[PDB]
Structure 1
Amino acid sequence: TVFRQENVDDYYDTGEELGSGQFAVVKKCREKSTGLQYAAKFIKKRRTKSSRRGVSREDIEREVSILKEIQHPNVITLHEVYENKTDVILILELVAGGELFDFLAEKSLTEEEATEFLKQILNGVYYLHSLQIAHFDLKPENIMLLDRNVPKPRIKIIDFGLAHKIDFGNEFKNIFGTPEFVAPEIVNYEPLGLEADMWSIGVITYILLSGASPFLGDTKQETLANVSAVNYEFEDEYFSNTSALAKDFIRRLLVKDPKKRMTIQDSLQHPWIKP
């Protein structure tokens, strides 16, 4: 599949940088014809077949195809795609309230505040998993607030760079995200499905409640070893006044066997979440 090959700057003016990763940089932008604002994600293309810098066209095409399916209040949307020889440029919905990660660094949250975010995250993941879309990169840096200066911020899930459609219940590729948030099946290079996202949600929930990361080691590999062993515990110093039901929620997500792990539907019916 090919994308619009006109110069993006003939149609948009760019502004503040919103994020910068390994192969992508995201810039605030404004469409000339409408005055409407977006976020332009510039993704570096691979320059040769066997190269290791940049993103493969197959990977970019998968990301675009997935993004095109999405319309939901808690998930980022795609407006337009441009390309040239160097980059593919995704014109994405603008979310201007910054990362949940940076937000958490200001405020630990109360259980009510934690569930305020969690419920939106769960609604967004429910949508994705209903479409057999596994995100595979759920973490606080990939949850964006619309407005961080309101008591109950609205959020959107971003970054579909590792997302996959799971049409056979499981998938077997090179997929591997951030050690603190990856499920044991990813660590052990086993077939992956929708369940891996649910583990990541357990990790996110632990962090929201405590301000600490449950599996974090001194190095990348030690974190990975902790994940595979399910080496975590609820520190009394952090959880002494947290409800046992909140711990129960996390406990049913941080489960090594993906088939024993709570599904997105289970999590929405869990007594801690369910109204």
Structure 2
Amino acid sequence: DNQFYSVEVGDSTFTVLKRYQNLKPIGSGAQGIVCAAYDAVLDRNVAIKKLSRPFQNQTHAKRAYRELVLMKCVNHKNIISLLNVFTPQKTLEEFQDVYLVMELMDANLCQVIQMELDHERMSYLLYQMLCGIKHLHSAGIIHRDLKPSNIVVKSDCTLKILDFGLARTAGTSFMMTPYVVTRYYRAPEVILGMGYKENVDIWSVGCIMGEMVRHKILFPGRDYIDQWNKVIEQLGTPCPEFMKKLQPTVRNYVENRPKYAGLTFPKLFPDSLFPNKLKASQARDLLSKMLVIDPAKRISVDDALQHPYINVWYDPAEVEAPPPQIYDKQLDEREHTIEEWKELIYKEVMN
């Protein structure tokens, strides 16, 4: 087309708007390919994600529409946004390809983890994560799968979350490197099948902060049995009132584990790992409130934002910024034929 041009990217071809130049592959998976590009209209770099075979089957089609709907629910500087969405095909009948354009960031938290950070940068990165997470929650989106590889950063110390609401396979994070498995970051209520609420994301933030501090994965379980053990060995055997909430067989498994005292937080995060004396105490205290097995006793997002270690950055405009829409979960249980999903997606793309 006059507006589009084609560029070969390994074994696929990107047909994109002419404003997007110098495309180069930065990530790839069975579910999509991501290129870095220069956006000549904005004079900014951009990430372009081409969905792979979105109409292969009903599942992929529903997933494609859902990704698009999730992106319109949010509008916050600590959450990746959809700068643009397009298709090079000119009618519904020819319609096949969907391209998503998002901000190109510089690294994910895997890179930050190995760095030694002052309290200002540590707390500020955490504060941005929390602002991002609060916004998702206000939009009816609970992430559940937060981890260093789906949190991205820039050299100006800004931070954005990606892959909210996406299956851990259709996400941008899965397509790119470095990558870490989600198992290490999942809350006890998730791995023990108890159901979860908003502060499921606080546990993950705690695991990530813990890893930024220790420069090593907090709970590197080889599987979900190992995962649970690693948690209890370090944090201690949870209270009886927590265990009573468990389903019958898993409750007995958990109750029959040897009883562990668990290490104190000064033991888990010694001064050795921190730079100033009030700030290390404050960080350790925040950690001891996020890394709490029982969600009923775990700190919420609002209280985390109010915590002394984080609160220094508080700006009500960043915290109380409301989402454009609230995600309708009736979408999760909606059925359409592929052709019907395709028309729905097409309308959203041409919107």
Coarse TM-score class (shorter-chain normalised): 0.7 to 0.9
Amino acid at match of 1:59: R
Q: Residues 207 and 56 from structure 1, CA distance in 2 versus in 1: closer, same or farther, beyond 3 angstroms?
A: same
Matched, 1:57 2:61: yes
> Quick check: which has more Rg, 1 or 2?
2
Tell me the residue number matched to 1:224.
227
Give the paired residue count.
247
Deviation, structure 1 residue 62 = 2.1
Q: What SS does the aligned partner of 1:205 have?
A: helix
Q: Residues 141 and 203 from structure 1, CA distance in 2 versus in 1: closer, same or farther, beyond 3 angstroms?
A: same
Tell me the residue number matched to 1:160.
164
Q: Does the 8 Å CA contact 1:136/1:162 hold for their aligned counterparts?
A: no
Tell me the residue number matched to 1:125.
133
Q: After superposition, what is the alpha-carbon deviation per residue over 1:22-46, rounded to whole angstroms, capped at 9, x for unaligned?
A: 6333211245666654211233346
Q: Does the 8 Å CA contact 2:70/2:165 hold for their aligned counterparts?
A: no
Q: Which has the higher helix share?
A: 2
What CA RMSD, in Å, does the superposition of the two structures yield over aligned residues?
Answer: 3.2
Greater shift in the superposed pair: 153-162 or 12-21: 12-21
Tell me the residue number matched to 1:240.
271
Q: After superposition, what is the alpha-carbon deviation per residue over 1:16-71, rounded to whole angstroms, capped at 9, x for unaligned?
A: 33334563332112456666542112333466548xxxx63223322221111222
- Structure 2 stretches of 5 or more lacking a match? 7-13, 90-94, 168-180, 236-262, 275-279, 313-351
Percent identity of the aligned residues? Answer: 29
Q: Residues 104 and 44 from structure 1, CA distance in 2 versus in 1: closer, same or farther, beyond 3 angstroms?
A: same
RCO (CA 8 Å, sep 6+): is it higher in 1 or 2? 2
Amino acid at match of 1:102: Q
Tell me the residue number matched to 1:189.
193
1:13-28 equivalent positions in 2, closer than 5 A? 13=21, 15-21=23-29, 23-28=31-36
Deviation, structure 1 residue 266 = 0.8
Tell me the residue number matched to 2:99.
89
Mapped to 2, the partners of 1:34 and 1:111 lie a distance apart of 34
1:1-275 equivalent positions in 2, closer than 5 A? 9-11=15-17, 12-13=20-21, 15-21=23-29, 23-31=31-39, 37-45=45-53, 49=57, 56-82=60-86, 88-95=98-105, 97-105=106-114, 107-147=115-155, 150=156, 153-162=157-166, 178-217=182-221, 219-226=222-229, 229=232, 231-232=234-235, 233=263, 234=265, 236=267, 239-241=270-272, 242=274, 243-275=280-312
Q: Does the 8 Å CA contact 2:54/2:64 hold for their aligned counterparts?
A: no
Q: Does the 8 Å CA contact 1:74/1:121 hold for their aligned counterparts?
A: yes
